[PDB]
Ligand binder design. Structure first.
Ligand SMILES: NC(=O)c1ccc[n+]([C@@H]2O[C@H](COP(=O)([O-])OP(=O)(O)OC[C@H]3O[C@@H](n4cnc5c(N)ncnc54)[C@H](O)[C@@H]3O)[C@@H](O)[C@H]2O)c1
Ligand SMILES: Cc1cc2nc3c(=O)[nH]c(=O)nc-3n(C[C@H](O)[C@H](O)[C@H](O)COP(=O)(O)O)c2cc1C
Ligand code: SF4
Ligand code: FES
Ligand SMILES: [Cl-]
Ligand SMILES: [Cl-]
Ligand code: NA
Lengths: 416, 155
């Protein structure tokens, strides 16, 4: 018995990451084993760690956590440094509009676990972690139970399936901080401290958990690892475009007829995601904007872009928030400002003061209580959150709002 | 101050879970809040000793992680998402319905100390917007009649 979870709609054209997770229920170890589960792990333990890294490298798998860093290459960088090494599964999620990771965790936990074991074996990590946001309590209990099932079937512990490979997966819980999804703040939280990001370089692969070589990978990235080993890297590379291969999860929300998670190839366009898969807009209203989480804003003129990691592509985590013709862009921008105001860790002065001021002055603009100075101050603040920032939060806190100012000038002008 | 044996056993279990004692800080704090309905300021000192951490470290950790409440004791925390998707889909309708049923606004506690409305950032169930949690349980708000029936399950 687990806490109540809303039944998020899930649809796939690939039947890979959502083979089981397309059904809104927990799939236990017996059901997973019936689908050939843990057989990729068996195949991996009969391979050298170096060969697994090579297959993952050749698969073209890129990080699904937002930055798109090549996974095989991240592993290579870690293994060039002496042990002990640590493997971390990043399950913090928490970016507005993003709900792709929880559906693997809550419905197909063994797909993630198998991926963690293979990945840990590949980098020589005998200690692995899942750091899950505190607001996913059901996901936490589901993972703890699934780990016990895996232990009981001999997939975890000492000398796994007689390979000589040892592994324990620990499940840690977050407690409200969005910044704990930034890999160094996550590491600080695992060490029992406040989620304060550390300057990079050094990257975690050089100095991470306890200052030791550490690989941090997103839930969705790890869920691909059993497929690469099961199919081989070549057959995996056949899925979607050869430059941006494999399955990808698209959390679609807002003004769509069918909101939910869609498993599609990355050559799908944003237009196809909304109209071909998510069933078009509510009330058949015109698309005004697409918010790529709290990161980017795309206008109705930019719907034909591919959902890949290319320069002109959608990028990010493939998070699609649809806004229609009657949605106030300034009101929408205020919610994005309020998000960054609430989540800055405050270590960096322009990020600390900038996230606060951007939201405070934007509230004044929206309520019609802003002076000429508040207007000019807001514009300046938005362009100056980034200077001296340690991490990606300060670098992007003004990004989406600046794009709304540039793509919707007429609407912002109404508020003057 | 002393923790009851049923809670102390759970805290020691979390402390023995990770390779290092200090890594259990957040699991211990979640356990304290689930048992008391908040973080009693008196609990920090015996928790610090069990974790073999200074009190200042523990205090800083409690203040940083905003799921922890040191101010108000509440049996059930109604976490209401106030982020972009839920706002666009009806956060205000959910808040209005909560005020009609319980007579309280965000940040407030019912006179019986039963419910507290906690405004929160994106809960990651955006396709099911407007989203709310009642302690560990999570739901899509549909209407006041539907909400009234959900809340009646929390006694
Ligand atoms: N999923 C979410 O919740 C979420 C939230 C906010 C932002 N984002 C995304 O996060 C991104 C920023 O994250 P970041 O700061 O971790 O990105 P990053 O560019 O610093 O690095 C991405 C990954 O590659 C590794 N890496 C990068 N350069 C490396 C090098 N030279 N050597 C070794 N490893 C290296 C990093 O350690 C990390 O694991 C943004 O692009 C944004 O889209 C996602
Ligand atoms: C503020 C901030 C929040 C982030 N949140 C997450 C998150 O919730 N999940 C995630 O996997 N990556 C998140 N990231 C990116 C991580 O720092 C890191 O790049 C990622 O976990 C690496 O895994 P990947 O290569 O498999 O994508 C965040 C980055 C920043 C700057
Ligand atoms: S940029 Fe902002 S969130 Fe990142 S470390 Fe600095 S203050 Fe914290
Ligand atoms: S915006 Fe409310 S759950 Fe994501
Ligand atoms: Cl099927
Ligand atoms: Cl002390
Ligand atoms: Na968190």
């Amino acid at each position: 018995s687990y806490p109540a979870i809303p039944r998020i709609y899930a649809e796939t054209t690939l039947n890979m990451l959502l083979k089981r997770a397309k059904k809104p229920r927990v799939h236990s170890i017996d059901e997973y084993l019936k689908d050939g589960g843990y057989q990729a792990l068996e195949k991996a333990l009969n391979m050298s760690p170096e060969e697994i890294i090579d297959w993952v490298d050749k698969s073209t798998l890129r990080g699904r956590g937002g930055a798109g860093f090549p996974t095989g290459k991240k592993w290579k960088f870690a293994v060039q440094n002496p042990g002990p090494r640590y493997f971390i599964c990043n399950a913090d999620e928490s970016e507005p509009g993003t709900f792709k990771d929880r559906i693997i965790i809550e419905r197909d936990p063994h797909l993630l676990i198998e991926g963690i074991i293979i990945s840990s074996y590949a980098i020589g990590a005998n200690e692995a972690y899942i750091y899950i946001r505190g607001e996913y309590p059901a996901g936490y209990y589901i993972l703890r139970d699934a780990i016990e099932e895996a232990k009981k079937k001999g997939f975890l512990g000492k000398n796994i399936l007689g390979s000589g490979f040892d592994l324990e997966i620990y499940v840690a819980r977050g407690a409200g901080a969005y910044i704990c999804g930034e890999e160094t703040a996550l590491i600080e939280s695992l060490e029992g401290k406040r989620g304060h990001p550390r300057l990079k370089p050094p990257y975690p692969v050089q100095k991470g958990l306890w200052g030791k070589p550490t690989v941090v990978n997103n839930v969705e990235t790890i869920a691909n690892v059993p497929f690469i080993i099961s199919m081989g890297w070549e057959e995996y590379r056949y899925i979607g475009p050869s430059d941006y291969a494999g399955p990808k999860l698209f959390p679609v929300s807002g003004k769509v007829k069918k909101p939910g998670v869609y498993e599609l190839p990355m050559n799908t366009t944003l237009r196809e995601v909304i109209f071909k898969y998510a069933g078009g807009t509510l009330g058949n209203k015109k698309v005004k904007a697409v918010f790529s989480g709290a990161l980017d804003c795309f206008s109705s003129e930019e719907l034909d872009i591919p959902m890949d990691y290319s320069p002109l592509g959608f990028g990010g985590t493939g998070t699609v928030i649809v806004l229609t013709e009657e949605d106030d862009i300034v009101e929408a921008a205020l919610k994005i400002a309020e998000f960054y105001e609430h989540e800055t860790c405050g270590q960096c002065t322009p990020c600390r003061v900038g996230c606060y001021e951007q939201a405070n002055l934007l509230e004044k603009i929206y309520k019609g209580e802003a002076t000429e100075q508040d207007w000019e101050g807001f514009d300046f603040v938005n362009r100056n959150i980034q200077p001296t920032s340690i991490c990606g939060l300060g670098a992007v806190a003004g990004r989406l709002i600046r794009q709304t100012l540039e793509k919707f000038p007429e609407e912002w002008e109404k508020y003057r | 101050f002393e923790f009851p044996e049923e809670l102390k056993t759970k805290l020691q279990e979390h402390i023995n879970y990770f390779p290092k004692k200090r890594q259990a800080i957040l699991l211990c704090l979640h356990e304290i809040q689930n048992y008391y309905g908040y973080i009693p300021p008196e609990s920090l000192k015996p928790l610090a000793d069990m974790l073999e951490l200074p009190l200042n470290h523990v205090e800083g950790v409690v203040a940083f992680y905003d799921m922890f409440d040191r101010e108000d004791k509440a049996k059930y925390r109604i976490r209401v998402c106030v982020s972009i998707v839920c706002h666009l889909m009806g956060t205000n309708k959910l808040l209005k319905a909560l005020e009609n049923i319980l007579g309280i606004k965000p940040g407030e506690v019912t006179p019986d100390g039963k419910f507290k409305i906690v405004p929160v950032q994106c809960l990651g169930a955006c396709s099911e917007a407007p989203v709310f949690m009642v302690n560990d349980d999570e739901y899509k708000f549909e209407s006041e009649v539907q909400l009234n029936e959900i809340l009646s399950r929390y006694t």
